[PDB]
């Protein structure tokens, strides 16, 4: 199962862009679909999503009015229109698929990039460090409409790679993902554990829920990166 995302590339500020999401395969199950973008080395940041019958749309504040998405399950595509495009729009764009109402994202595309030329927040620590071995927390607090309502998600980025899920209800573990991660929350934060540090844990993490006064809206932590240490961490 493979999401593949295309339409991307260079745009005249002011113009309209198509972007759409397909799919390698079809599921038996009902899926809405989400836009995710990431500006060149930045956050991620939820755009929008669409039900699976396209009756429910919801939009993040910086593309209501302009971005419009939409489906077609008989082609099995998922669009997003995006108009009066800006510079600040300027980001490679995910599609991600979340089953019902579960709010986390198992599938992402590969992400397309799109360029405009002009010519509540979940916090994060922004930067954790360890040596190979040790144990590393990282915090994502948030207030009661976000975190204090609903589950806590974590996605790891390894560098250069899309988004991938780690943490999904607080604490549960996709197939895949060891025991050395795990996770917790308590009242109006999270905290994301990794023990027995390794060299391919070196990349971004982000905590992620939903807003809103019916949680209809996604949210993603500001993100932490995590740097391995080539070091000891003995005395001498
Ligand atoms: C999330 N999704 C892609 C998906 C879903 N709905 C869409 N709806 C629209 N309108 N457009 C799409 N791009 C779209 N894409 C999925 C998810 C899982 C499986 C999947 O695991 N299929 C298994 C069977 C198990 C299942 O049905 O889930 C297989 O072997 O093919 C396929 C597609």
Redesign the pocket.
């Known amino acids: 199962?493979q999401?593949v995302e295309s339409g991307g590339g260079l745009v005249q500020a002011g113009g309209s862009l198509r972007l759409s999401?397909?799919?390698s395969?079809?599921?038996?199950?009902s899926?809405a679909?989400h836009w995710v973008r990431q500006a060149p080395g930045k956050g991620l940041e939820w755009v929008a999503v669409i039900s699976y019958d396209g009756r429910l749309k919801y939009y993040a504040d910086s593309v209501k009015g302009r971005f419009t998405i939409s489906?077609?399950?008989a082609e099995?595509?998922?669009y997003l229109q995006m108009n009066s495009l800006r510079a600040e729009d300027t980001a490679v764009y995910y599609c991600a698929?979340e089953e019902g109402d579960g709010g986390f994202f198992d599938?992402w595309g590969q992400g397309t990039l799109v360029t405009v030329s002009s010519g509540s927040v979940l916090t994060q620590p922004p930067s954790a460090s360890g040596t190979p071995g040790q144990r590393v927390t990282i915090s994502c607090s948030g207030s009661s409409s976000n975190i204090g309502s609903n589950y806590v998600n974590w996605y790891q980025q390894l560098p250069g790679t899309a988004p991938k899920l780690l943490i999904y209800r607080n604490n549960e573990r996709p197939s895949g993902v060891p025991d050395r991660f795990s996770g917790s929350k308590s009242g109006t934060s999270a905290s994301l554990a990794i023990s027995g540090l390794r060299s391919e844990d070196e990349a971004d993490y982000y905590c992620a829920a939903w807003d809103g006064s019916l949680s209809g809206r996604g949210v993603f932590g500001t993100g932490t990166k995590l740097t391995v240490l080539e070091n000891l961490y003995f005395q001498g």
């Open positions: 199962v999401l999401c397909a799919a395969r079809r599921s038996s199950r899926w679909m489906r077609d399950n099995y595509l998922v698929a599938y």
